Symmetry: D2
Subunit: 458 residues, 4 copies
C-alpha cells in the first residue's frame, strides 16, 4: 500500500498546488512568485518575446531600477543560439525590491511582459541534513494525527484503541538519542507473536534467503527471538548499530513517503510498536511490529543489503514527488518483495514475502509471474492491494541491484547530489566543487592510511 | 602525570614479567611458553646451534612425532644466508601435542637444545575491536578499585568521599549506549564552577586559540556553559556526536594508559563527573570534570583536531608499553599542552594550558622555553609534576601535526595495522590483504558516488 | 586460424614436454628438476608418505646436510589439517647443493622417497617486461624461418616469393624505436588495393560500426586511405600513437600466440607489409596488410576499444598455454569477429568481419547464429577455417566487454599480476605489496593533482 | 642567464603591448578589443557607472539590438553586494555584431560609457596540447633566426660558424618522431670533450649526488660516456625513454622561456648539438651539448626528479609572463643549481653545478651562502651572470621539493588546470568537471586493477 501512499502524497501535493491560486482571479500579477527577506522581497521574472526587434526588456530593467531595488543577478541570452528548436526565448532576472515598491514596479513591468512566468521553477522539496532535525521537524509536522482504521478488519475493540494510544504516545514523544521506552505485552499479543513465530520459523528453513536465516539465528541467540518472549526494540537497535550500523525509530500515524525515504537515507528505520489484530493473525491490514521484526529487521542485518537500502535512501533525497513514487515502487518490488538467485535455486528476502505465511507459500509457487529484476521495469510496474502479488523481480546478487540503483540514481536528474557522513551521521549537499574537494581530502587520507597498512603488512 | 601513569603501567608490566618466573627454579623446561587448545597444547621452540655439522634438529623433529603431535608449521632456514652479521641461527616450529605428552616429549627435545627459547616473541597486547567490549571488559578489568587521594591536598572532608563514591557508582555501573545519568550539584561545587568559569572566560579572549573561543561560544549558547549552571554530560555528548562525531564516557579510579588510548581510538573520551576540591580551586591535584569541560571538550569540537586525536588513538592500538609511553608523552605535549601559530601570533590550545589559570599566564610568558613541535622530540622530552611546564611545542597548523603523526605511526613497527569504521564504529585489523581489498571496495564505491555527484553538478 | 595457431602452439609445447624425458630410462632420479647457480644447484623435493609413524623425513634432511648444502627454505606441514579430503601429504624443501654432491646426496634421499616429485610446479612462461626486449628476444627467437605457403592458393609466382623475401628482410631486421622503412608498391598490388578499397568502402556505410566509419574518414583525410595510393605504416603509426597511443611493428613468419598477446599487452600491434595474392583478391588464405589496415587499424583508433584490447593483453601475461588458447579464442570472437548493438540496430566491428566482403555480407545476414557476448562462452565455443562463421557474439557497449574481461582476468588464477606504465611504457610485476604501494603513490599523486584542478575550477 | 631570458621575454611582451596602440590617437573606440568570426565580430564591453540612478545601460543594450546582433551572454550585477570596498561597478556583455555594423553601433554605445574597458582581460597565452604541435608551431615561430655571439668569447673562427650552421640546420629541420640525425665530431671537439670528461669525472666522486654518480655509471656502461667517444643523442634519448620515460629534441637560436617550459611539461628536453669553444673549455658563455650531457642528462635519469621537473612544466602551462619568470627562477635555483642533503652530508645535483668545474669547487666551499630551499624565496631571489653564484638552496629530499612545488602551483591562480596523459603523451585542459570525471574514470579503472592484483597476491 506504499505505492498507494506515494500516489496519495503526490495527489495531495498537486491538489495543494491546485489550491495555491488566489481566491480572487483577474490579477495578472498573481503568478509572480516572490519571497520577502529583511523587509524587502527577492524574486525573479522571465519574458519570452518573439522575433528580434521587440527587445523592450530595457523597459523591464527600467522598471527594476525605478525603486532602487537590489539586483542579485540580471542576465539575458536569446535562445536558438546554443540549441535550436527545443528551447524558447528567455532572459533571467533575480532581484530584491522593497516589498511595498515591489508590487508598484511590478505594475510597470506588466507593461513589458504578460504571457510568461518567473524563471525559477521548483526550487527543492525540503529535506533534513542531520538525524536531529529528521526527528524534530518530522514529529512536529506529524503532530496531532490519530489513526482511525475502524473500517479495517477488527480494530473495534477498545483495548486495541488504548494500545494504539499508548504506542502513539511513546513514539510521538520519543526524541533522538533517547533509549527505547520498553513497552509491556499482555497474554494476547504474546500468544499471537508465539503463533506467528512458530508458523514462520517452521517454514523459514524453506523458500527463505540464507542471509535471513543466519540473521534470524543470530538474533534469536542474542536478542532473544523466541515464541515465549516478544523482543523489544532497544536491544535489536543496539545489535543492528553494533553490527550493521543501523538503528530504529518508533513512529505512528500516516507516514508520508518523503519522511520514510529520508529515514532510510539516514540509515534509520521507522517502526511501530504495536502488532496486528488477534482476529487476523494470518495477515495484517497494515504492517505492524512483527512485520518489521520478521520481514525488515532480519534481512536488514546484511551489510551489503543495508548499504543498498542506504543508497536508495540517498537517491531519494530532494527528489520530486514523481521520483518519490518511483523510489517507493522500487522499494516495494525490492525490499518488501524481493527474490534472490543463490546456490542455484531461488529464495525470497522480501519484507512482505517474509511477513505473510500465505504470501510466503504463494511467492515460490509457479502461479505468480517471476522475472529478472530491472530498475525501470520495477519503477513502472503497478501493484495490487489485499491480494497476493503475481509479478515478482529476482536479483541474483545484491551487488547487482546496488550498481543498478547507482546507475538509476545517476540518470535521475537532481540540481545537486548527496553524500553521507557516518562520522557525524550527517548529510552534506553536493552543489559546489569545494564540498567535493572536502570529501576527497578525507578519501585521500583514508587511502594514505591504507597505503601505510599495506606497507606495514608483509 | 600521565607520563608518570605510563611509566607506572610499564614498570608494573615488567614487574609482572619479572614475577612471571616459576617459584621453583632448576627446570630448563620452564621457559617453553605454551598454551592449551582443545585438550592439547600448541606451542613453539627455537634452536640456535652453531657451525654446520651439528644439525641434529632431526632428533628434535624425531621428538615431535614421538607422540603423534599435530604440527601446525615446521620450518628450517639457517641464518647468514639472507642477512649476514645481524641475525643468528634459527628454525621455526609450531606444533600441537597432547598436554600430558607435551612435557614428556619436551624432555626428549631437551636432549637437542638447551640454550635457546621459543621463536614466537610478544604476540600482542590485547585491544578491543568495538565500542561494546571497550566498555564491558575495561569496566570488568577495573572493578573494585576506589581512589584514596588522602595525602593529596584537601580530600579530608567526608562529603568529598561520599561524592567520589557517587561518581564511582555512576561511572562504573554505566554501560555503553545508555544515556548519561544526571548528577546533582550542591551550592559549593556550583560556586567553585562559577568562580573558575568567570576567571577562565575573562582571560580566554587572550592567549587562547580561536577555535577554542568559538567552540566555547557555541557550547555556552547551546549546551549552556554559564557560571550559574554547571553543564551535564549527556547534552555535551549529544552536541559533540552531532557535530564532531564524538562522545564521552564516565570513568573513575586508576585508569591505565592503554584503555585511555583505546578510548581515544574509538572517538570516545573518558571523563570524571566530580570536580576539584573547593580548598584548591586555582589548581587540581588530579584532572576533574571542569578540566575536561574547559580544557579537553572545547578544542575537541574541532573536526581536524578530533581527527588528529583519533589518528593518535589508532596508532596507539596494539603498541608495546614503550610505544604506549611515547604516545602518552606526545598526547601530553600536544593535547594537554599544545601551542598553535595562527594569525601571526601564538595561541594556546593545550588542555592543561586551558585548565589552569596560572599555567595559562605562564604558557604565553617569556620565561618558559618554546620550540617548534617535533614528534620524536616531544616523545623523548621529559615532564614535571606539580610545577609549571618550562618546555613547550608549537604547531602552526593541526594538519601539520596530523601528517607528522601519520609519519610517526608509519615508522612505528606493528605486526598489523588498524582501520576505523564509523558506520558500525568498529575496528578492523589489517594483517591480510583481503581486509585491505574489503576496505578498498568501499573506498571505490565512495569514489563512484563522488564521480556521480561531479557529473550531476554543472 | 589463430585458434588453430594456439592449439598448434600448445600441442608443440606438450610434445616438447613429452620429449623432455631422458633418452635412457631406469633412473628414478631423472624427475628431480634442478637448476645450477654459481657452481651449485638449487632445487626442491616433495614427499607424500602416508600414515603418521613413517616420518623418516629426518633421513631426507639428514641427506641435505650430508654435503654442507645451502638451504634456502625447509618447511614441513602434514596435510588434512587446513583442508581435509582434497590435499595430500607434503612438505616443502628448497636447497642448494654442490652440483657434484647434489646427485651424490640425492642418491641417499632416494632411500627416503620414491613415489613423489619436486614441490615446485610450473614456475612461469617467460614474458618481456619492456618494449625493447619484446622486439629483441622475439626477433632472435623467430630467426631464420621463411614462409612456404606453396600449397596455399596462388603463391606459385616467383615475384610473390621475392616480395615475401623483401617484407621478411624489412620486418626481421627492424629494431624498436626505428622508423618504418618505406616499401614500394608496383601496379598490381596498388590495383588490388584500389579494388578492395572501393568494394569495402562502398559497403562500409552499411553493416559497419560508426566508430569504424569515423576512424576511416579521419584516416583517409590525414593518413591518405585512398584507392590510388596504398598507405604506408609510419604515418598511420604516428597517427595512432598521437591519438590512440598505439603503434605497429612489422613482422613475418610463423608468429606464436604468446608473442602476439605480449605485443597486444604493450599497446603495440604486429603487422605484415605484403598483401594477399592478386589471384584471390576477394579473400586471403592468411591475413595481410590490407586485413589489418581495414579490419584492425580503423576500429583500433577507438580509445575504449584500444584500452579493452590492452586489458586483454595484460591478462594474457604469464598465462599458461591453455589460458593462451582461451585468450586467443576470446580475441577471435571479439576482435576478429565482434558485433555491437548501437543506435538500436546491430553493426559489425570485427577485424575479420571488416576484412572480407563475403563475410561482411554473411555476418549481418539471418543465416548465421547470433547471440549476446559471453566471456566463458566465447572462450569455449570452437571455430571453422576457410568457411564463413555461423556463430557470432554481440556486445552492445565496449565498456561491458571491458568489465567482463576484467572479471574473467580476476577469476583467472596467476601467481602474480601485471600493471602497465605508459610513462616508460613498461610492465611491472605485481607479486609483492611494495610494488602495489609504489603504484598507489603515483595514483595518490594523480588524485592530488585532480583535487588541485577541482579547487582551481569554479 | 635564463632569468635574463625570462626578463627579456616579458619586457619584449610588454613593449609589444606598449606598441599595441593605434598609430592615430583621438578615437575613444580604439580600446574596444574585438575579434571577427564568420563575417561578424564577437566582443565585450564593461561599464562602471557610479551612484544608482544613472542606470542608462538600457541605452547600451538599446545599442546592441540596433543592428540585430547575436548576443552570446548579457549579464548585469551591481557591485558592493557580494563584496564591499574592493570591487567596483560592472556588468558583463558578450555579443556578436556585423563587423560593419559593429563600429556603427559602438558609436552609439559610446553615448553610454566612456571611461571603462572590455570585461574580458587576458584570455590566455597560447600553449600546445600535444607533442606534434609543440614541435611544428615552435619551429615555425622560431624560423630564420641565426645566432651571432660574435662579441662572446671566441666564436671568431669561421669553422665554429659553419658548425653552428650545421647544428641549426639539423635541429630546425628536425620533426617530431624522427630519429636523431647523427652528427660527426672532428678531433678538436672530441679532444675538448675528453678533457672536460676527465676533469669532471675525476671530481664527480666528490661533492656530487649519488643519483648523478649512478646515472653516469649506467650511461657510460650503456650509452658510452667515455673520453674517447663523445656520445650522440639518439642513444641517450632511447635510454631515457626506456627507463625514465624522457626524450630530447635538438634546438638552436634564441629559445623563449615559454617554449622551454612547455617542452619541460611534455617530458621532453630541448638540447643543442654543438659544444663550447675550445678556447674556453673551462666554462661556456652559453650552455652547450656537454652542459646538458653532464649537468642535465644524468640527474634527469631519476624517476622522482623527472617527475618533479614534469610537475614544474605542468604548472608552467598558460601562466602569465610574470609567473613564467617565477618558474624560470625556480628552475635556475633548483635544476641548474640545486643542493641535496643525503647520507648526512650535502651534495650537488644542479645542472650548472654539474657543468662547471670552477663552480663545482665553489658550490661546496664555505664562501657562498647556503640556505634551505624555499619555493617563494627561490622565486624572488635574483641571480648573477658570468660570476659564481653566492646564494644556494638545498633540498634534502626531492619529494619535499615536489610537494612544495605542488603547493606553489596550487596557490598559483589559473583559469584552468592541466593534466598529462602518458598513454597518448598529450595535455588535456581542466576547465569543466566533465574532463575531471573522464580522468577519474581511468583512475578508478587503475584502482580496480590494483584491487584485482591485491586479491591475486597472497
Ligand atoms: N511504507 C509503507 C509502510 C511500510 C513500511 C515498511 C515496510 O517494511 C512495509 O512493509 C510497509
Ligand atoms: N591520562 C591522565 C588523566 C588525564 C586524562 C585526560 C586529560 O585531558 C588530562 O589532562 C589528564
Ligand atoms: N593471430 C593470427 C594472425 C592474425 C593477427 C591479427 C589479426 O587481426 C588477424 O585477423 C589474424
Ligand atoms: N634556459 C636557458 C638555457 C638553458 C637550458 C637548459 C639548461 O640546463 C641550462 O643550464 C640553460
Ligand atoms: Fe515490509
Ligand atoms: Fe587535560
Ligand atoms: Fe584480423
Ligand atoms: Fe644547465
Amino acid at each position: 500500500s506504499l505505492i498507494e501512499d506515494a500516489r496519495k502524497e503526490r495527489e495531495a501535493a498537486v491538489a495543494a498546488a491546485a489550491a495555491a491560486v488566489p481566491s480572487e482571479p483577474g490579477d495578472p500579477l498573481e503568478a509572480v512568485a516572490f519571497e520577502e527577506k529583511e523587509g524587502k522581497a527577492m524574486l525573479n521574472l522571465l519574458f519570452s518575446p518573439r522575433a528580434t526587434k521587440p527587445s523592450a526588456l530595457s523597459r523591464a530593467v527600467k522598471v527594476f531600477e525605478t525603486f532602487e531595488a537590489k539586483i542579485h543577478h540580471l542576465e539575458t541570452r536569446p535562445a536558438q543560439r546554443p540549441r535550436a528548436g527545443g528551447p524558447h526565448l528567455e532572459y533571467f532576472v533575480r532581484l530584491e525590491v522593497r516589498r511595498g515598491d515591489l508590487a508598484a514596479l511590478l505594475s510597470g513591468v506588466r507593461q513589458v511582459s504578460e504571457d510568461v512566468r518567473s524563471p525559477a521553477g521548483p526550487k527543492v522539496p525540503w529535506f533534513p541534513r542531520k538525524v536531529s532535525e529528521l526527528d524534530k521537524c518530522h514529529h512536529l509536522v506529524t503532530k496531532f494525527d490519530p489513526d482511525l482504521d475502524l473500517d479495517h478488519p477488527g480494530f473495534s475493540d477498545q483495548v486495541y484503541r488504548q494500545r494504539r494510544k499508548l504506542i502513539a504516545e511513546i513514539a510521538f514523544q520519543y526524541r533522538h538519542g533517547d533509549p527505547i521506552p520498553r513497552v509491556e505485552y499482555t497474554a494476547e499479543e504474546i500468544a499471537t507473536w508465539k503463533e506467528v513465530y512458530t508458523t514462520l520459523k517452521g517454514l523459514y528453513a524453506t523458500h527463505a534467503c540464507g542471509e535471513h536465516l543466519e540473521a534470524f539465528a543470530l538474533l534469536e541467540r542474542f536478542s532473544g527471538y523466541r515464541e515465549d518472549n516478544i523482543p523489544q526494540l532497544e536491544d535489536v537497535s543496539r545489535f543492528l548499530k553494533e553490527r550493521t550500523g543501523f538503528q530504529l525509530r518508533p513512529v505512528a500515524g500516516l507516514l508520508s513517503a518523503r519522511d520514510f525515504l529520508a529515514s532510510l537515507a539516514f540509515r534509520v528505520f521507522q517502526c511501530t510498536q504495536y502488532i496486528r489484530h488477534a482476529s487476523s493473525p494470518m495477515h495484517s491490514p497494515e504492517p505492524d511490529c512483527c512485520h518489521e521484526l520478521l520481514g525488515h529487521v532480519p534481512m536488514l542485518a546484511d551489510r551489503t543489503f543495508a548499504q543498498f537500502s542506504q543508497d536508495i535512501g540517498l537517491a531519494s533525497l530532494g527528489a520530486s514527488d514523481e521520483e518519490i513514487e518511483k523510489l517507493s515502487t522500487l522499494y516495494w518490488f525490492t525490499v518488501e518483495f524481493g527474490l534472490c538467485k543463490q546456490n542455484g535455486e531461488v529464495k525470497a528476502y522480501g519484507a512482505g514475502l517474509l511477513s505473510s505465511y500465505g504470501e510466503l507459500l504463494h511467492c515460490l509457487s509457479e502461479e505468480p509471474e517471476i522475472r529478472a529484476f530491472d530498475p525501470e521495469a520495477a519503477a513502472v510496474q503497478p501493484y495490487q492491494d489485499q491480494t497476493y502479488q503475481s509479478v515478482y523481480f529476482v536479483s541474483e546478487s545484491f551487488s547487482d541491484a546496488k550498481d543498478k540503483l547507482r546507475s538509476y540514481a545517476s540518470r535521475i536528474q537532481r540540481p545537486f547530489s548527496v553524500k553521507f557522513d557516518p562520522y557525524t551521521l550527517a548529510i552534506d549537499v553536493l552543489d559546489s566543487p569545494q564540498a567535493v574537494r572536502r570529501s576527497l581530502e578525507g578519501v585521500q587520507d583514508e587511502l594514505d592510511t591504507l597505503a601505510h597498512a599495506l606497507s606495514a603488512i608483509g
